[PDB]
């Protein structure tokens with residue numbers, strides 16, 4: 001099964017998911033001089049209920065905070081989106097080195113990590129699973145993490161990491177004030193892309209925030225102690241879980257600001 005190790009990593013994903021070589025793949029290089037400001041984009045409008053988070057788990061590929069998506073308690077609206085997109089899950093990507101961990105790269109700068117907030121178009125589709133298969137099904141908000149002061153908003157997450165060391169482990173996790181983790185500016189870049197993990201479906205409106213949040217090196221290192229292996233499988237660590245950048249293939253990256 002897919003992963004980020006030598007034989008199962010990003011270069012080999014095309015073997016089992018041919019869409020890996022598609023024309024709308026993520027993540028990408030954002031070359032700001034080629035970004036087009038678009039005055040018709042709208043501001044992001046976010047409502048995240050801290051009661052929505054229910055469980056944090058080790059998927060074997062990152063941690064995954066799952067949110068109850070029974071109705072519209074937590075939503076993303078506005079930005080490049082038509083209609084309201086419902087919060088599903090949050091996870092994080094990193095690398096083995098603090099200066100090369102993010103999936104999106106900005107003028108060649110890789111950040112230390114990148115947080116993904118995954119939402120689905122409930123205004124048009126009846127479930128996450130159905131939305132994940134449509135070009136306007138999903139919206140992911142991307143937040144960069146840069147090395148700096150320790151971030152107290154990440155303490156809730158890092159305190160659970162020991163309890164979810166092995167793949168498949170999970171721990172109840174609620175009252176997570178995700179709003180308060182975001183940067184204070186919500187200026188963004190946007191482009192049509194894909195899931196950055198298998199099955200790599202081309203169903204994602206990416207909304208990448210310009211402003212990074214901080215994390216300390218010691219906070220970030222905790223994530224690398226997660227395993228990509230389950231209880232009673234020979235241990236291997238998830239030291240890096242970011243996909244390389246993919247060809248832009250004539251897509252337009254637009255900016256909400258100038």
Ligand SMILES: CCCCNC(=O)c1cc(S(N)(=O)=O)c(Cl)cc1Cl
Nearest residue numbers: 059091116118138140194195196197
């Ligand atoms: C345990 C299931 C496998 C893990 N899958 C993901 O974490 C995932 C990632 C993105 S990403 N990296 O594109 O934001 C999206 Cl859009 C949707 C999903 Cl479902």
Ligand SMILES: [Zn+2]
Nearest residue numbers: 091093116196
């Ligand atoms: Zn992701």
